[PDB]
Design a protein around this ligand. Structure first.
Ligand code: MG
Ligand code: ZN
Ligand code: ZN
Ligand code: ZN
Lengths: 115, 112, 559, 266, 46, 86, 140, 155, 69, 244, 49, 140
């Protein structure tokens, strides 16, 4: 049997970090962030929010192999804007949007009568 | 059949010619019949070609038969591969078969 | 034959093969369990003293690890049962048998292994699960599919063979086979189907998808190409993105039927500096065809660059097709009413024509064709008329098929299917023949106990007027089954006959080799050819070219 | 608050129908993905068998038991067995259930999920109770017995997510649609004579105006106003699936921010 | 199990073609059920 | 030694063959793996095969290929003088 | 940078062919009787009908001030000014052929990511068109 | 006129034109003497056999007779100046590539061509009025005194 | 052998509707389509789970127990 | 495999949130390549899927008997009456991004059967293990930790590749390897070697100083000894007698 | 559901596969090839049951 | 009662059989979807087939719509059906076989065949009804 344990999809293993930022030598002011134990759920959401930023230049993500739960995020920004700061802003925007969504759903649900 | 022969102008133009296809082979006798072009008569059985024209003629006929079979299905194989097999089959002065009574009767070591 | 010419060997593994679109052409996925069992003896050197020592600490129960340590005296220590004495101190000149790691060169084979490309060297890639994994593009040289096929793996055990395997048997070096001086690998199946759709003029891509597709090409310089359409909305064409995967400096020009510089049907091909100008990329360009992109790239930039092309095209095309999708259903085999009416009358007219010849033959007024009997001549006329009816009906159905027809799309791209498949699936299965002849009278003067004696109508002798969509009648079903049984019997017998022929040919020419004097000689030294191929060139470096002097008229020659 | 807007159409104990507006496609898709694969839930994980005279194998019964839905309203108060400091399991990270069935009657006797009895200290929580969602009061038909057949076993329930195993999935099929009129041209309709006549109209078409029948293609439009229908297996209320689905997605993004902050310090 | 209990065998010097599906087989042996190997045509099913 | 063709009358190709390159690289890689003196400066390399490739590129492999002929005669070609173009 | 070619054409006809988003249009210059244009246009974004008059312009670069894979394409930013602001349909492509049709007639072939164009005219009106990349700007 | 040959001269010309960015309008600096001598001397460097005796030299000339015909036809004085419009720098580049390409295409000594030929002919056989296909291949590989359908073609 | 607990495609609990399905067919004389819709199985993935199920446990129960307490 | 000659092995497994989904949330339990349909012309595979879809929706059992009046158009009419596309196509959404697939997927139930062939019963590897008593080569059989045959055809391919050293490695180091002593007078393996005492002798030649050792496969040693029993004497000599 | 029709030999279920043979007591006339002095032959395998 | 008659191959030679009584027996618009059927217009039939589908065997009777499949495919399925896991017998618990495979949840096919009624396929099915999608999703 060679089936990997299912908890390896989300549980961080020994000697492994959630994020791994390295500089992209091909283009200036570009970095590559490797997310461990994550999948398209966050890659698509994070990438889409980044593309809404005017100062962000290039935003793309890819899962090299479905076997391993890890995806790479490439962020390039305008000169003087840190790609890490761009990731900070995008994540904050997602959280704020999600927080409003949770409040809106609860208020609407309270008005319903059938359930 | 249609054969491309140079035109008097200099270009290649196809014109029809009358050809006789026969069942059964008598190469030596048919070649002498008047009215035919003896320099173009061809025989399906390269055995008759070998014993009437020569080993080199049989080699060319043998390659032609092998080429037709491979090209009959549409597959294409480089010329050198066919030539090497034909040359091996005619390197001893005759048509040696690829069975145990042909190449396996040579002097190439008992172990081989 | 069973113990000297061929024998069972160690350091080998077998398991089912599966397709991995995310694996490189020269990479092979190896199950973790197989990697642990297989080992490679590595000589301890100052360069690898640290790495090898760590593996011994890991032991044989944790990949990467080791299983044995061999001293300079020949003594071999099994790491199991050896931990009782604590750690072992390695020394230069020792050998550590450690689990095969990534990038290790191994030999990958599939039987019957009828040609050399059936045995090629891959780079190990340890992966989870119980199956092997290899690129789709390499299936064709192996003649392998993923319906349950098992393939062998062999691990070299010395540096001499380790370097030999990677420098002579590596997959990138086998792209251009010498059998037919044309590439043996190409884009196929899903990837081939997607590339045809992607390169259509109507295929445009927005910014969000373009960035992801660009990033999927590993060797991307990081420069976003200018969109073909700048206003009123930035759009990228499929040709533009596919051009990123093509290495710069590649030129390819092809002219199809009616093709011109302003290709109206978008046929042909024109690539300048790696940029696709016009033409739909299909089997004629990215397939294993002479003079195609693969043939040009490998001969111009090198085998390694060509190998990268396979992955880049596959990755970009696979990603695009994942988010576009392609399917096929029953609706793709259905032709509109007007087409079916035309198909029905085409068969009816052919049946009437077959009747017309039959009546005159019964009247004895039919004169046999020269060199043929009355019945054989009559059969030839009927067979030709019915075959043309199927072809004419098939053309009517095929022409009616729209560009959105999934079955038609695959045929146009060359991925799968053909004209005959569409005709039988939609228009008419056609005549069934056994031993190259119509259905014979197994009974007394009839084919089945349902017709009358001495019946020569197309239905009686096995003409399937229906299609697979419409179904076959019980009489047609049996006759169609009879034709199939002929193929199954032929396939089984032909496989045995061809295998013996292949063995005989190899044994007859096994001792022939090209020597340093360019002569071709056997073991005895007897000269077969004074120069190989009568020219002295290698088939892998031969291309079809036109001699401009032989052809043309005299006036054109002077001009 | 002026962000993703919601409007509930049909609300039920098992199904909630709502429209997600003023939101991005990426956000909407992640919500359904999280709602399917990342909401913690209580389910039977380990089964101890001491007597199995049934016609079914021990693994057959164990697999069925894990699929039995258990109440998970107070799952957040439970702790992951991996993150708990105990040898095998305790009351802080597990719920123990016992099943004892015997064939005392001549007719076949059915073993239902209602026969499961909790023998752990719930500590005032509201988890571990099998979900009964029928009229007769029985649950899932686990096994059948005849005279002389006994089934004695002990079950241990732990919290987990459907990513590890589908038995922890608290949500059944989730409907998800947008642009029912195909105004964004995200689909090329396969057709034979007329695509409009050959493709049935979506029920959601009533909530959007039809195309103006001649207006130019709108190339500046982006997908929004998603129609979703979330179904629940009964382990947790359907509303909580959406509420907890948003919370889990919020936590995942927050984890990235926390990790990014951590590397800045170190 | 049902197919095996209804199988038939034909031992293959003979001058004929027993492997082919003859017309007389209609309604007596299945025209499709046969081994794909060397037993093709020789082994028939009622 | 009548089977040693003099260097002035060698008629074989001056280009290294694929088999010659493969064996030379493998032959020297094995020697490197067995602690042989490396004659090329290493900018960081642990694989013996990669080291041999570096030596071949800079022509620092002290080996001569004895090309045999069908009659038994041979010609000695140094790796340094053999052209590596393939 | 600067306009290499500028003229007004009348669309003679439009042929959709097998494409649902791209149409090939044949047009002739209004001022010159020896100039005609064949062009492929993404009608889904810029519909074109018969008898329509189109102002076709070809330029080396879109930036206003003269400045004669070059650079990574970037999304337009607020306040960005370029030649594209004055037109409706803009395409970027590469010339790949120059053909001599007659004594003074020259034809230039362009490809905008697979969309082909052919601009034929007098040798003295298309002399500025070179074998390089150019922007095709069209205004209704 | 279309036959397999080692070196693709057409691709080499295309690479030279694009690599050096031939103007295609300004006259080239090539001279008629240079072109004629350039092609003539290139034919001498196309070496397959390197013997220094008459017999080997004769074989060397014959081994490249067909290739030289292609070489001369493509690299003609008018074609180079008119059809290709090659420059002196481009012309020298083209000649060097042909020499390098030709030398790389030569057969490598030690190649097991016999096995290669047998496998190249065998593999197509597995995929397979007069006998054809595998049965005809059996009749050819085995020298059968009596073949199924002997025939005579008379012109 | 016995009714599956959950629907394979979507995971909906269908193992508590087997007895109800049989009761509707027998006592209420309802056709299979109406019974499935009455039980609330709208998606055809759930319908086939109960419609195509074969109850082999009853056949096994005919055999006497191997070990009797 | 299905009931139409279509068989395949699982390529990869995806969870529900990754598989494509319809507007109703139904996700496929299995996905097969469209390319298998055209060439093989298994129309019944598509008809069964269309028939099964209607049968599941209507709660009936489809009639798939070969020769009947049932037609695709008749099945299509029933399917459309249930609110689905007549030909079975459905609009699906990409699971990774949630966007609609530009193409519509033939979606419906189908009968599938699991075959006896499982990878766990076929995967096996061997680095070293038991040897046959007779030939002293790797035993045959996965269950007995046997090896994998490197047959004659495999030998030919390596010969074509030119990997002479690799061919020797497979046939000697990866298989039976045996060292024997031969006499310089007679090429027979009849030398009694006392390795502990460093003594060699070929009785019948009365020599103890002209001994050589050769590495040959144990099968080769067995062959020559078998030939010796047949009165044939193979003599192995380490130097050429006749000129090349 | 077991259909029987088989034997139990040493605990192993064995099924007798029906054997196909040419019917006896029937006259059959066959043609012979050219290399033989006989053109036609009528053969009957007389059998008593 | 003289309503059915046993007929062998030898006796098949001297009789005329009608495939179906629906159209062949009666003395003698059309739906375009229906297949083309030949009446044979014979008024001397001596027998009639019980049903044409009975020509198939046990294995081939499980194939749905075998007349809509290419003949080689039908042969292949007959071989694979014997290799499918299912419920060979209901007393496998008391039997001691060398090897046995039993499916957890066998399901009867949604689309079945009438001939399968007498093979007890519904009572002992070998397979499951899986929702299959024909798409090029990920290339795996
Ligand atoms: Mg296969
Ligand atoms: Zn605990
Ligand atoms: Zn369901
Ligand atoms: Zn001796």
């Amino acid at each position: 049997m060679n089936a990997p344990d299912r908890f390896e999809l989300f549980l961080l293993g020994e000697g492994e970090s959630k994020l791994k930022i390295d500089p992209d030598t091909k283009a200036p002011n570009a970095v590559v962030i490797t997310f461990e134990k994550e999948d398209h759920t966050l890659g698509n959401l994070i990438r889409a929010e980044l593309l809404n930023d005017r100062k962000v230049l290039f935003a793309a993500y890819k899962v090299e192999h479905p076997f391993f739960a890890r995806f790479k995020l490439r962020i390039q920004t305008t000169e003087g804007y840190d790609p890490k700061d761009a990731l900070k802003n995008a994540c904050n925007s997602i959280i704020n949007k999600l927080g409003a969504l949770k409040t809106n759903f609860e208020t609407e649900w309270n008005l319903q009568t059938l359930a | 059949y249609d054969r491309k022969v140079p035109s008097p102008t200099g270009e290649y133009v196809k014109e029809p010619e009358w050809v006789l296809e026969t069942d059964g082979v008598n190469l030596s006798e048919v070649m002498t019949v008047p009215g035919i072009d003896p320099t173009r008569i061809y025989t399906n059985s390269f055995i008759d070609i070998m014993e009437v024209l020569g080993i080199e003629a049989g080699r060319a006929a043998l390659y032609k038969e092998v080429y037709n079979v491979i090209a009959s299905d549409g597959s294409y194989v480089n010329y050198r591969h066919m030539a090497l097999l034909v040359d091996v089959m005619t390197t001893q002065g005759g048509l040696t078969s690829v069975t145990r009574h042909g190449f396996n009767r040579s002097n190439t070591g008992a172990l081989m | 034959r069973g113990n000297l010419m061929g024998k069972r060997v160690d350091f080998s593994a077998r398991t089912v093969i599966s397709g991995d679109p995310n694996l490189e052409l020269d990479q092979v996925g190896v199950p973790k369990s197989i990697a642990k069992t297989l080992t490679y003896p590595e000589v301890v050197t100052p360069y690898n003293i640290d790495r090898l020592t760590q593996l011994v600490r890991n032991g044989p129960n944790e990949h990467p690890g080791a299983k044995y340590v061999i001293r300079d005296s020949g003594d071999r220590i099994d790491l199991r049962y050896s931990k009782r004495a604590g750690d072992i101190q390695l020394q230069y000149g020792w050998k550590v048998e450690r689990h095969i790691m990534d990038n290790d060169p191994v030999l990958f084979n599939r039987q019957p292994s009828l040609h050399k490309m059936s045995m090629m060297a891959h780079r190990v890639k340890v992966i989870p699960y119980s199956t092997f994994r290899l690129n789709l593009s390499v299936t064709s040289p192996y003649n392998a599919d993923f319906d349950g096929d098992e393939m062998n793996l062999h691990v070299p055990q010395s540096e001499e063979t380790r370097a030999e395997l990677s420098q002579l048997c590596a997959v990138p070096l086998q792209i251009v086979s010498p059998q037919s001086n044309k590439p043996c690998m190409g884009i196929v199946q899903d990837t081939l189907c997607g590339i045809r759709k992607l390169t259509l003029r109507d295929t445009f891509i927005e910014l969000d998808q373009v960035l992801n597709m660009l990033y999927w090409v590993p060797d991307w310089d990081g420069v976003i190409p200018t969109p073909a359409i700048i206003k009123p909305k930035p759009l990228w064409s499929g040709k533009q993105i596919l051009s990123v995967a093509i290495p710069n400096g590649i030129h390819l020009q092809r002219f199809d039927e009616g093709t011109t510089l302003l290709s109206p049907k978008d046929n042909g091909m024109l690539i300048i500096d790696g940029q696709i100008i016009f033409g739909v990329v299909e089997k004629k360009t990215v397939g294993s065809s002479n003079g195609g992109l693969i043939h040009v790239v490998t001969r111009e930039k090198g085998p390694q660059v060509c190998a990268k092309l396979f992955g880049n095209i596959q990755k970009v095309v696979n990603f695009w097709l994942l988010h576009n999708g392609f399917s096929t259903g029953i609706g793709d085999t259905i032709a509109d009413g007007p087409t079916m009416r035309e198909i029905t009358e085409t068969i009816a007219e052919a049946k009437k024509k077959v009747l017309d010849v039959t009546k005159e033959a019964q009247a004895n007024l039919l004169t046999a064709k020269h060199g043929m009997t009355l019945r054989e001549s009559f059969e030839d006329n009927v067979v030709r008329f019915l075959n043309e009816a199927r072809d004419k009906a098939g053309r009517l159905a095929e022409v009616n098929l729209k560009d959105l027809n999934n079955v038609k799309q695959m045929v146009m791209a060359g991925s799968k299917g053909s004209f005959i498949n569409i005709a039988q699936m939609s228009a008419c299965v056609g005549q069934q023949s056994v031993e190259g002849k119509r259905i014979a009278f197994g009974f007394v003067d009839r084919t089945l106990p349902h017709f009358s004696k001495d019946d020569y109508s197309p239905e009686s002798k096995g003409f399937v007027e229906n299609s697979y969509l419409r179904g076959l009648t019980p009489q047609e079903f049996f006759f169609h089954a009879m034709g199939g049984r002929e193929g199954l019997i032929d396939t089984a017998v032909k496989t045995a006959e061809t295998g013996y022929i292949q063995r005989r040919l190899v044994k007859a020419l096994e001792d022939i080799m090209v020597h340093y004097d360019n002569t071709t000689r056997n073991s005895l030294g007897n000269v077969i050819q004074f120069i190989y191929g009568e020219d002295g060139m290698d088939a892998a470096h031969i291309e079809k070219q036109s001699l401009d002097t032989i052809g043309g008229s005299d006036a054109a020659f002077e001009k | 608050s002026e962000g993703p807007q919601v409007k509930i159409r049909e609300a039920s104990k098992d199904n909630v129908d709502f429209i997600l507006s003023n939101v991005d496609l990426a956000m909407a898709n992640s919500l359904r993905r999280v709602m399917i694969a990342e909401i913690p839930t209580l389910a039977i994980d380990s089964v101890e068998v001491e007597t199995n005279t049934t016609v079914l194998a021990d693994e057959f019964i164990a697999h069925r038991l894990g699929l039995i839905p258990l109440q998970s309203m107070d799952i957040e108060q439970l702790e992951y067995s991996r993150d708990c400091f105990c040898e095998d399991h305790c009351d802080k990270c597990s719920v123990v259930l016992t099943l004892q069935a015997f064939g005392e009657s001549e007719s076949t006797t059915n073993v239902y999920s209602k026969d499961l009895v909790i023998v752990s200290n719930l500590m005032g929580r509201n988890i571990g109770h099998p979900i009964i969602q029928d009229k007769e009061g029985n649950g899932v038909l686990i096994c059948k017995l005849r005279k002389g057949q006994e089934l004695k076993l002990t079950c241990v329930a732990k919290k987990g997510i459907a990513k590890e195993h589908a038995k922890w999935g608290p949500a059944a099929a989730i409907e998800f649609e947008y642009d029912p009129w195909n105004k964004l041209k995200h689909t090329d309709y396969w057709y034979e004579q007329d695509s409009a006549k050959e493709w049935p109209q979506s029920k959601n078409c009533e909530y959007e105006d039809p195309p103006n029948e001649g207006d130019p293609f709108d190339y500046k439009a982006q997908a929004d106003t998603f129609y979703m229908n979330v179904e629940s297996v009964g382990s947790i209320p359907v509303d909580q699936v959406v509420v907890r689905g948003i919370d889990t997605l919020q936590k995942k993004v927050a984890s990235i921010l926390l990790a990014l902050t951590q590397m800045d310090q170190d | 199990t049902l197919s095996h209990l209804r199988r038939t065998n034909t031992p293959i010097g003979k001058l004929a073609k027993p492997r082919q599906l003859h017309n007389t087989h209609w309604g007596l042996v299945c025209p499709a059920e046969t081994p794909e190997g060397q037993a093709c045509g020789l082994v028939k099913n009622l | 030694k009548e089977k040693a063709i003099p260097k002035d009358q060698r008629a074989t190709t001056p280009y290294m063959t694929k088999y010659e390159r493969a064996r030379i690289l493998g032959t020297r890689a094995l020697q490197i793996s067995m602690n042989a003196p490396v004659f090329v400066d290493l900018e960081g390399e642990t694989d013996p095969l990669r080291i041999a490739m570096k030596e071949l590129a800079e022509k620092k492999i002290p080996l001569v290929i004895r090309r045999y002929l069908p009659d038994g005669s041979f010609e000695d070609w140094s790796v340094e003088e053999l052209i590596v173009d393939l | 940078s600067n306009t290499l070619f500028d003229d007004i054409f009348q669309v003679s006809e439009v042929d959709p062919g097998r494409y649902n988003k791209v149409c090939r249009i044949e047009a002739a210059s209004t001022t010159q009787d020896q100039c005609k244009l064949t062009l492929d246009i993404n009608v889904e974004l810029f519909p074109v009908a018969a008898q329509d008059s189109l102002t076709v312009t070809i330029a080396s670069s879109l930036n206003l001030e003269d400045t004669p894979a070059t650079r990574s394409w970037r999304p337009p930013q607020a306040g960005d000014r370029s030649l594209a602001d004055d037109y409706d349909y803009v395409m970027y492509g590469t010339a790949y052929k120059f053909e001599e049709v007659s004594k003074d007639l020259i034809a230039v072939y362009y490809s905008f990511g697979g969309l082909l164009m052919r601009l034929e005219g007098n040798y003295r009106n298309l002399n500025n068109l070179k074998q390089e990349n150019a922007y095709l700007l069209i205004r209704r | 006129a279309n036959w397999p040959l080692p070196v693709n001269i057409r691709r080499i010309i295309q690479n030279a034109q694009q690599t050096f960015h031939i103007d295609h309008t300004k006259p080239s600096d090539l001279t008629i003497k240079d072109i004629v001598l350039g092609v003539k001397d290139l034919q001498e460097n196309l070496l397959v056999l390197r013997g220094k005796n008459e017999i080997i030299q004769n074989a060397q000339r014959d081994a490249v007779t067909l290739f030289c015909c292609l070489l001369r036809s493509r690299l003609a004085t008018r074609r180079v100046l008119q059809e290709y419009r090659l420059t002196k720098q481009a012309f020298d580049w083209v000649l060097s590539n042909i020499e390098a390409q030709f030398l790389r295409s030569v057969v490598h000594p030690g190649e097991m061509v016999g096995v290669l030929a047998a496998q190249s002919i065998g593999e197509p056989a597995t995929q397979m009025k007069v006998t054809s296909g595998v049965p005809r291949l059996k009749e050819i590989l085995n020298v059968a005194k009596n073949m199924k359908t002997p025939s005579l073609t008379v012109y | 052998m016995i009714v599956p607990v959950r629907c394979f495609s979507c995971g909906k609990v269908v193992g508590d509707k087997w007895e109800s399905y049989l009761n509707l067919l027998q006592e209420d004389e309802l056709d299979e389509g109406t019974a499935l819709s009455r039980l609330g199985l709208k998606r055809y993935c759930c319908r086939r789970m109960i419609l195509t199920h074969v109850d082999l446990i009853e056949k096994f129960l005919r055999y006497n127990p191997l070990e009797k307490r | 495999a299905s009931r139409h000659g279509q068989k395949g092995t699982i390529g990869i497994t995806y969870r529900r949130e990754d598989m494509p989904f319809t507007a109703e949330g139904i996700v496929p339990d299995l996905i097969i390549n469209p390319h298998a349909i055209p060439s093989r012309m298994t129309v019944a595979h598509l008809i069964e899927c269309l028939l099964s879809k209607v049968a599941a929706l209507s709660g009936n059992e489809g009639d798939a008997s070969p020769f009947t009046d049932i037609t695709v158009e008749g099945i299509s009419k029933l399917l459309r009456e249930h609110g689905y596309q007549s030909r079975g196509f459905e609009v699906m959404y990409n699971g990774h991004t949630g966007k609609k697939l530009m193409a519509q997927i033939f979606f419906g139930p189908t009968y599938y059967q699991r075959l006896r062939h499982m990878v766990d019963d076929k995967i096996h590897a061997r680095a070293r293990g038991p040897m046959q008593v007779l030939t002293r080569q790797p035993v045959e059989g996965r269950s007995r930790d046997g090896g994998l045959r490197f047959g004659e055809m495999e030998r030919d391919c390596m010969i074509a590749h030119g990997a002479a050293s690799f061919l020797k490695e497979r046939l000697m180091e990866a298989s039976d390897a045996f060292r024997v002593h031969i006499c310089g007078i007679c090429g027979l393996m009849t030398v009694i070697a006392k390795l502990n005492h460093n003594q060699f002798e070929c009785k019948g030649c009365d020599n103890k100083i002209d001994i050589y050792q050769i590495h040959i496969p144990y099968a080769a040693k067995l062959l020559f000894q078998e030939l010796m029993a047949m009165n044939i004497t193979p003599r192995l000599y380490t130097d050429r007698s006749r000129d090349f | 559901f077991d259909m029987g029709g088989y034997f139990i030999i040493n605990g192993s279920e064995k099924v007798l596969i029906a054997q196909e043979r040419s019917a006896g007591n029937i006259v059959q006339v066959f043609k012979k090839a050219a290399p033989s002095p006989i053109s036609h032959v009528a053969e009957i395998r007389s059998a008593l049951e | 009662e003289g309503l059915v008659e046993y007929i062998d191959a030898e006796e098949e030679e001297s009789i005329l059989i009608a495939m179906q009584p629906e159209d062949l027996e009666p003395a003698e618009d059309v739906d375009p979807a229906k297949r083309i059927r030949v009446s044979h217009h014979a008024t001397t039939f001596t027998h009639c087939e019980i049903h044409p589908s009975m020509i198939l065997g046990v294995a081939a009777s499980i194939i749905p719509f075998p007349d809509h499949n290419q003949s080689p495919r039908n042969t292949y399925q007959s071989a694979m059906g014997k290799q499918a896991m299912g419920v060979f017998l209901t007393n496998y618990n008391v039997r001691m076989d060398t090897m046995a495979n039993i499916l957890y949840y066998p399901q009867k096919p949604l689309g079945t065949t009438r001939a399968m009624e007498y093979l007890k396929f519904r009572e002992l099915p070998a397979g499951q009804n899986a929702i299959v999608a024909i798409a090029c999703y990920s290339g795996y």
